[PDB]
Each structure stands twice: as C-alpha cells, then as structure tokens.
Write a protein that binds this ligand. Structure first.
Ligand code: HEM
Ligand code: HEM
Lengths: 145, 145
C-alpha cells in the first residue's frame, strides 16, 4: 500500500532526506550521472532496459544518458518537495510508477537503485543512516509497482 | 538546430524567464493545474490526448491530473536551471521532445501551450514582454518536434 509506505516517512526520516538532498541535489548532472553509471556497473543485467539511451558506458559523454540523468534528479527534487503533503507525494509517486510499469520494471528491480544511492551518499560522507532514509523513500515507489 | 534555438536566448530573455519563474514556479501544484485546465478550456480538441488522466474536468480533485501537472512544472524547473549551459538545455529538451513525439504531438500542437502560459503569467501581472520570453523557450522545444 503506497499510503502505508508514505506513512513511514516520519519526522526524522524527512529530516535526513532533506539534509542529504541539500548536498546531493546541488549537482544534479554530476550526481545523476554517477547514480546511473553505478547502477550499470553493479547491476549489469539492467542495461538492456535502457536501449533507448545507446552506449551507456560512455557516461557523461552520452547526451541521452546525461538528459536522462538530470531528469531523474528532478523526479527526486519533486518527491523531496512533496514530503509535507502525503496525498501530493502519493500522486507524483503514482505518475512515475506508471513510467516504470510500462517498461516492465518490478518492485524488486526498482530496488536495485538502493546500492547506487548508498554509494553516492557515501562518497559525500553520508552514512548508513542516510542510505536507510533513502530506502524508505524508494519503498514508497516500490509499493506502487 | 535545437542548439541554435537554445543558443539564441539572450541575457534579457533569460532574466525575464528567471524573474517570472521565481513567482510562477513557487506554487507548482496551483500553477501547473491552472495551466492544464486552461489548456483544456481553450483547446478542447486536446482533451482526447490525456485519456490516461481520466476525467480532467475534476480539476485539482483528480489525483492523476494533479500528479501530471506538478510533474510538468518540474520539467519547466529543469529548463530554467539549464539556461546558462546550452549543451545541457539541449539534452533535456530532446528528452522531453521524445515524450511528445511518441504521443504524436506536432511542433504546432506543442505551441498550443503559449495561450495558457500567457494567461497564467497575466494572472500574476507579468505582461506581454514575459509571454514573448516564454514563447521563445517553448520555441526551443518546437525546434525538436
Ligand atoms: C531513484 C529511482 C529512480 C527514479 C527517480 C527514476 C526516474 C525516472 C524518470 C523520471 C524517467 C523518465 C520517464 C519517461 O520519460 O518515461 C525514468 C525512466 C526509466 N527508468 Fe527510472 N528511475 C529510477 C530508478 C530506475 C531503475 C532502478 C530502473 C531499472 C531497474 C529504471 C528504469 C527506467 C527505464 C528503463 C526508463 C526509460 C528510459 C528511456 O527509455 O528513456 N529506473 N526513470
Ligand atoms: C510547457 C509545455 C509542456 C511541458 C513542459 C510538458 C511536459 C510533459 C511531461 C513532463 C510529461 C510526462 C511524460 C511521461 O512521463 O511520459 C508530459 C506528457 C504528456 N504531454 Fe506534455 N508538456 C507540455 C505541453 C504539452 C502540450 C501542449 C500537449 C498537447 C498538445 C502535451 C501532451 C502530452 C501528453 C498527451 C502527455 C502524456 C500524458 C499521459 O498519458 O501521461 N504536452 N508532458
């Protein structure tokens, strides 16, 4: 249930999301590209979903991947801005869920982003506490898939 | 080229965009929904394209409509944040263009948003100079369609 998952975003979780986002969200291009390339490198079996982007091993040099990456960072921006209001967060979550459901992405496959998030956070000196906050957010999308 | 169109936006046009977005982009739910419902009122022929959103006449009450509208505002957020780097603006524009090409939305039909934008701007007392600036940004997307 997306509503019950949404309810798990307590005060403290909300705080850690915001605090960490101030750092990560400040370089959407660099951080968005790092997230995607870490996904591809650690979870080789997902690359086939992204045929439209072309040669993903090109990283920042691939225009489509750069376009994709920036845009994904605005989806995260979106979620962060909706934390005050659960009915609003849920509706945006459901919109992006649709984008993945049509590409045949399951909850389980969607959760493969947790690895890359924890890594990108760690590279910025945000630890397990923060990785765990982010898993709770990703879980809300999971509940929609 | 899109690059050409992007590259042409001047310091004055950029200033007008940023200034008006400071206001319009501060209420993404209210302003995005306003944009969409004005499109529907003025261009009833477009309603059919949005069948996934269900009964668009329900306004803010329609959760799918609200999610699409807030998300639309973040596409604009993205555009605005990329104005100083034509290379980055081009790659996000091309990403959004693909979303519309796939729904068979022509450059001319995309341009139907100018009306709703002019009205929303007007609502906050941004006049003709501001609507012309926004038509120039829209023209970047039309360059890709
Ligand atoms: C933090 C988690 C994620 C976010 C916020 C997110 C966000 C997005 C957004 C905004 C789009 C563009 C939607 C569209 O234009 O149709 C998208 C597309 C896509 N996503 Fe995700 N994504 C995430 C994780 C994942 C993961 C883990 C997978 C694969 C396991 C995945 C697979 C895809 C694919 C295949 C597409 C379409 C790419 C294309 O052909 O343009 N996403 N994602
Ligand atoms: C400022 C102008 C516009 C912006 C920034 C914008 C942005 C977006 C975004 C971000 C999406 C979601 C893409 C996806 O997830 O698949 C979308 C979808 C869509 N757009 Fe636009 N759009 C604009 C104008 C228009 C206009 C003028 C039309 C029609 C004449 C249109 C038709 C569509 C349709 C049919 C969809 C798919 C809706 C659905 O079934 O989910 N768009 N747009």
């Amino acid at each position: 249930s997306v509503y019950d998952a949404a309810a798990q975003l307590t005060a403290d979780v909300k705080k850690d999301l915001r605090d960490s986002w101030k750092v990560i969200g400040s370089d959407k291009k660099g951080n968005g590209v790092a997230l995607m390339t870490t996904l591809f490198a650690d979870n080789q079996e997902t690359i086939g979903y992204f045929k439209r982007l072309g040669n993903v091993s090109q990283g920042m040099a691939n225009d489509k991947l750069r376009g994709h990456s920036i845009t994904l960072m605005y989806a995260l921006q979106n979620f962060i801005d909706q934390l005050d209001n659960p009915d609003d967060l849920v509706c945006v979550v459901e919109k992006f869920a649709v984008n993945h459901i049509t590409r045949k992405i399951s909850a389980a496959e969607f959760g493969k982003i947790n690895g890359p998030i924890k890594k990108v956070l760690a590279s910025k000196n945000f630890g397990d506490k923060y990785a765990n906050a982010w898993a709770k957010l990703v879980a809300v999308v999971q509940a929609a898939l």
